[PDB]
Task: inverse folding
C-alpha cells in the first residue's frame, strides 16, 4: 500500500560466516582456482 | 601405465641427465698392403699384398 512495502531476502552467507582467517584453516579440500602466496607461486609456476 | 586414465598434465622438463661419455679413443689403420714385410727402396720398390 501507499507506505508499507514488503521485502524479500536471501542470506549473504559469504559475508556472514567466512570473515577473517577462517578458510585458511581448512584442510583436505579439493581446490580449483585460487590466488597464490609468493612461495606457492614459485611452486605451481612451471605449471602456470 | 598405458591407459588414458590420468590427470591433465603439462609441465615436463629435462629433469636429469646421465651419459656414457667416450673418454678415450682407439684407431683402425686400414690399408691394402702388408705393413709387416719388405717395402724396399725408391729405386727398387716392393708392394706386399
Result:
Amino acid at each position: 500500500n501507499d507506505k508499507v512495502c514488503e521485502l524479500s531476502l536471501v542470506p549473504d552467507v559469504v559475508m556472514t560466516y567466512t570473515q577473517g582467517n577462517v578458510l585458511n584453516t581448512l584442510n583436505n579440500v579439493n581446490v580449483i582456482r585460487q590466488h597464490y602466496t609468493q612461495t606457492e607461486y614459485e611452486q605451481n609456476l612451471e605449471q602456470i | 601405465r598405458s591407459n588414458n586414465d590420468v590427470l591433465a598434465t603439462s609441465t615436463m622438463r629435462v629433469h636429469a641427465i646421465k651419459s656414457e661419455l667416450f673418454t678415450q679413443l682407439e684407431y683402425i689403420l686400414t690399408i691394402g698392403a702388408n705393413l709387416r714385410k719388405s717395402f724396399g727402396t725408391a729405386e727398387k720398390p716392393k708392394f706386399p699384398s
In short: Chain B touches chain A through three residues (CB under 8 Å). The CA atoms of residues 31 and 49 of chain B lie 10 Å apart. Chain B is about 0% helix and 0% strand. The radius of gyration of chain B is 29 Å.
